Design a protein around this ligand. Structure first.
Ligand code: NI
Length: 341
């Protein structure tokens, strides 16, 4: 049974609700982005209308085999009528194809569903500037003040400078980057660009990247591993055993691995500056965990909500425990008393 925080009142609509069977009264299923916890349940046998971005619809058709007649892609930043209700899709600053959804209800209520997002001051000059929002369905993944991390630009600077130094010292070093979903493509693309290399990967991952509308992508990626000195591997293989085994497969072309694990937040964030991050090393293998986030920090979340001034907040992450729910509600009330709405 579909939880209440996935249902849009006064409509036939649900958001990210594909694992509950046929939801009673649902006439259109929205999908915010192509991450498995959100698309869980979709397959080639799905027969109701799915509403999403163009990039999400490419992934549904090629990766999950959803038939074309049920995929309804919408352009961004454009007023659209769906089943009699005005909607807008906005860039969520999450992974490729990820959107927030603005719903203009027939009774005059306006609802914003963030999906998953990384709040940014540029959102204060989107189509959100133009009218009031009554209800906010909020990605609360990092809703606590301990969750700090750097900008994506600082993290990429660290990665590029680290990789360029290592491979210039040793031209026989291989760089490896972990992945297990779409998102965070800038990590491996920025490193390959500084090294003058294409990124090498499996046929399955190449197929996925070919769905993303990234400009000039054919110039940047390849399935020919032998031609590349930046390789992508599954995240599970980013450990000393997995990496030793990969280096064996490269036929004595390389004699050192430098590997990156983009995580979200880890508790090494509460003590250490990005500047000061060091790797774990065993022999000729070194592994860096880098805090590249595609979700809001606490401070970015608080600035967005204090700007928007919603009448009601419905969290969509960390909803399973009473302690989490009570913590989130306390911060919402602080924010509202501080700003005066
Ligand atoms: Ni996500």
């Amino acid at each position: 049974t579909c939880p209440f925080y996935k249902k849009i009142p006064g409509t036939g609509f649900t958001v990210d609700a594909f694992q509950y069977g046929v939801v009673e009264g649902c006439t259109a299923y929205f999908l915010t982005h192509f991450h498995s916890d959100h698309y869980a349940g979709l397959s080639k046998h799905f027969t109701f209308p799915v509403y999403c971005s163009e990039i999400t619809g490419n992934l549904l058709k090629n990766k999950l085999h959803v038939q074309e007649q049920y995929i309804h892609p919408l352009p961004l930043d454009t007023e659209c009528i769906v089943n009699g209700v005005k909607v807008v899709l906005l860039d969520a600053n999450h992974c490729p194809g990820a959107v927030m959804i603005l719903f203009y209800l027939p009774n005059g209520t306006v609802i914003l569903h963030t999906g998953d997002f990384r709040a940014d001051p540029s959102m204060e000059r989107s189509l959100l500037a133009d009218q009031k929002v009554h209800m906010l369905y909020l990605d609360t993944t990092y809703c606590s003040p301990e969750y700090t991390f750097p900008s994506q630009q600082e993290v990429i600077r660290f990665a590029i400078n680290t990789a360029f130094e290592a491979v210039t010292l040793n031209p026989h070093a291989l760089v490896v980057c972990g992945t297990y979903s779409i998102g965070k493509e800038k990590v491996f693309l920025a490193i390959a660009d500084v090294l003058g290399s294409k990124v090498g990967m499996s046929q399955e991952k190449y197929k996925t990247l070919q769905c993303l509308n990234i400009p000039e992508i054919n110039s940047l990626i390849t399935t020919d591993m032998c031609s590349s000195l930046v390789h992508l591997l599954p995240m599970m293989q980013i450990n000393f055993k997995g990496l030793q085994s990969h280096l064996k497969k490269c036929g004595g072309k390389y004699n050192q691995i430098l590997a990156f694990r983009p995580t979200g937040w880890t508790h090494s964030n509460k003590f250490t500056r990005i500047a000061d991050v060091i790797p774990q090393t065993k022999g000729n293998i070194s592994i860096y965990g880098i805090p590249y986030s595609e979700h809001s920090s606490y401070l970015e979340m608080k600035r967005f909500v204090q700007w928007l001034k919603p009448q009601k907040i419905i969290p969509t992450v960390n909803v399973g425990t009473w302690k989490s729910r009570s913590t989130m509600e306390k911060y919402f009330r602080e924010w509202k008393l501080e700003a005066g709405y």
